[PDB]
């Protein structure tokens, strides 16, 4: 247990230097530079979490990498509360439809049977993916995980994953001792992660590499888990075609099975807690690649059509359609925004001459 107040001279010196470095760079467009006013900085710079995490453990990645988009990470779950004067305005700027005073709703994956066929003929949708993240309750996040923590957490995760049955049965590949053969195989699958880039390095997210880091996938290669890549868990369900029901059902079954053994870190206002605040709330990152060549003639598709369902469009005539909303709605609501939006877009495509 650490005290809520008092940071040492070195930490205080590095914070002041970091604030200055941010100020000097007038071209810097990170949300960190935007939101860390001198007033907020002066208020919170001498605070700590009970894990001993300071403001430097929050902002350092965005200081060392001025080109960061967001620029902060949570060094532990308590950081979201202790440094809320910074996290809150950043979270509410980035996320769509979430504002201070809101409480993210309790988890609810909803009724899977309400998802029908979207494109069973395979005339439109190229691929379907739904990604979630989780932190394991009772553990620090990267900058203050100990080596023993990494080992203990990995054992817990692998015990869960290695007990999955049926549609989820698969193999765990530790990063520790990973062979060149397995690296090559996983790269072909787009399943491999490696030591973090410059943003994760500066966040102290890569200590004790690669202890406690690993990759799991089912035999069908339609379910992927990363252990300790950035979050404790990154959990993805995916397949070719447009069967969003099947993709989502498989994800729900996996997360429920994992939760039975391992509780997840959770916050009364922010939902599931993650290392990067961009992944809060439901944590859902759904992405569907869809061929809409007739609609491609007019970006009445982007704003307006997809946007009516809070979906984002990104580009011949194939688009990645994703959910704008991650916080302030249930899992069911987010996946149904995707379902309903994709249904409207497909209607527009067929009706278009």
- List all residues 6 or more positions away from 274 whose beta carbon is below 8 Å from its beta carbon: 74, 133, 134, 135, 231, 280, 283
Assess 174 for contact with K ion (CB under 5 A).
no
- Please name every residue paired with 227 in a beta bridge, in sequence order, or none if there are none: 214, 233
Question: Mapped to the 3 state alphabet, what secondary structure does 14-68 carry?
Answer: HHHHHHHHHHHCCCCCCHHHHHCCHHHHHHHCCECCCCCCCCHHHHHHHHHCCCC
CA-atom Rg of the chain in angstroms: 21
Tell me whether residue 100 or residue 263 sits nearer to K ion (CB atom). 100
Q: Supply 227's token pair.
A: 């252990």
Site string for ligand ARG, 100-139 (x = CB under 6 A): ----------------------------------------
328 binds, among K ion, ligand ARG, none (CB under 5 to 8 A by kind): K ion
Tell me whether residue 88 or residue 119 sits nearer to ligand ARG (CB atom). 88
Tell me whether residue 131 or residue 294 sits nearer to ligand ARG (CB atom). 131
Window of 68-76, 174-182, 258-266, 330-338 that interacts with ligand ARG by CB under 6 A: 68-76
Q: Binders of ligand ARG among 274-293, rule CB under 6 A?
A: 276, 278
| Of 97, 105, 210, 307, the one binding K ion by CB under 5 A | 97
Work out how close the CB of 69 gets to ligand ARG at its nearest, in angstroms, rounded to a whole number: 3
Assess 230 for contact with ligand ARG (CB under 6 A).
yes
Window of 66-74, 114-122, 168-176, 324-332 that interacts with ligand ARG by CB under 6 A: 66-74
295 binds, among ligand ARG, K ion, none (CB under 5 to 8 A by kind): none
199 binds, among ligand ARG, K ion, none (CB under 5 to 8 A by kind): ligand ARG
Q: Binders of ligand ARG among 182-201, rule CB under 6 A?
A: 199
Assess 61 for contact with ligand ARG (CB under 6 A).
yes
| Of 70, 150, 223, 226, the one binding ligand ARG by CB under 6 A | 70
- Integer angstrom CA distances of residue 14 from 8, 18, 31, 109, 209: 10, 6, 20, 43, 25
Work out how close the CB of 278 gets to K ion at its nearest, in angstroms, rounded to a whole number: 12
Assess 328 for contact with K ion (CB under 5 A).
yes
Work out how close the CB of 260 gets to ligand ARG at its nearest, in angstroms, rounded to a whole number: 28
| Of 71, 75, 214, 328, the one binding ligand ARG by CB under 6 A | 71
Work out how close the CB of 73 gets to ligand ARG at its nearest, in angstroms, rounded to a whole number: 7
87 binds, among ligand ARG, K ion, none (CB under 5 to 8 A by kind): none
Window of 117-125, 132-140, 143-151, 325-333 that interacts with K ion by CB under 5 A: 325-333
Window of 53-61, 190-198, 213-221, 324-332 that interacts with K ion by CB under 5 A: 324-332
Q: Supply 118's token pair.
A: 């979207």
97 binds, among K ion, ligand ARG, none (CB under 5 to 8 A by kind): K ion
Q: Contact, 340 vs 325, CB < 8 A?
A: no
Return residues touching K ion (CB under 5 A): 97, 328
Which chain residues interact with ligand ARG by CB under 6 A? Answer: 61, 68-71, 199, 230, 276, 278
């Amino acid at each position: 247990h650490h005290h809520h107040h008092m940071v040492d001279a070195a930490v205080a010196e590095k914070l002041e230097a970091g604030f200055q470095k941010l100020q000097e760079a007038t071209n810097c467009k990170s949300l960190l530079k935007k939101h860390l006013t001198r007033e907020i900085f002066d208020k919170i710079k001498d605070l700590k979490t009970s894990f001993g995490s300071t403001l430097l453990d929050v902002i350092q990645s965005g200081v060392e990498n001025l080109d960061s988009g967001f620029g902060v990470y949570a060094p532990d779950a308590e950081a979201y509360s202790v440094f809320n004067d910074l996290f809150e305005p950043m979270i509410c700027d980035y996320h769509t439809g979430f504002k201070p005073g809101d409480a993210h709703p309790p988890r609810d994956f909803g009724d899977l049977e309400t998802f029908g066929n979207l494109d069973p003929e395979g005339a439109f949708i190229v691929s379907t993916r739904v990604r979630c993240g989780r932190s394991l309750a009772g553990y620090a996040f990267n900058p203050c995980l100990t080596e023993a923590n990494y080992k203990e957490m990995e054992e817990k995760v692998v015990a869960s994953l290695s007990s999955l049955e049926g549609e989820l049965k698969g193999t765990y590949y530790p990063l520790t001792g990973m062979t060149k053969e397995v690296q090559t195989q996983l790269i072909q699958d787009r399943f491999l992660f490696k030591e973090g880039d410059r943003f994760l390095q500066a966040a102290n997210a890569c200590r004790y590499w690669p202890t406690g880091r690993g990759i799991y996938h089912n035999d069908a290669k339609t379910f992927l888990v990363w252990c300790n890549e950035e979050d404790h868990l990154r959990i993805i369900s995916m397949q070719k075609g447009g069967d969003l029901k099947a993709v989502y059902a498989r994800l729900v079954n996996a997360i429920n099975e994992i939760e039975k053994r391992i509780p997840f870190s959770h916050h009364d206002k922010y939902g599931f807690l993650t290392f990067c605040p961009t992944n809060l709330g439901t944590t859902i990152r759904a992405s569907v690649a869809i061929a809409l060549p007739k609609l491609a003639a007019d970006l009445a598709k982007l704003e307006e059509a997809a946007g009516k369902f809070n979906l984002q469009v990104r580009g011949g005539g194939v688009y990645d359609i994703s959910n704008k909303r991650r916080m302030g709605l249930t899992e069911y609501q987010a996946v149904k925004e995707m379902y309903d939006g994709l249904q409207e877009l497909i209607r527009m495509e067929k009706e278009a001459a």
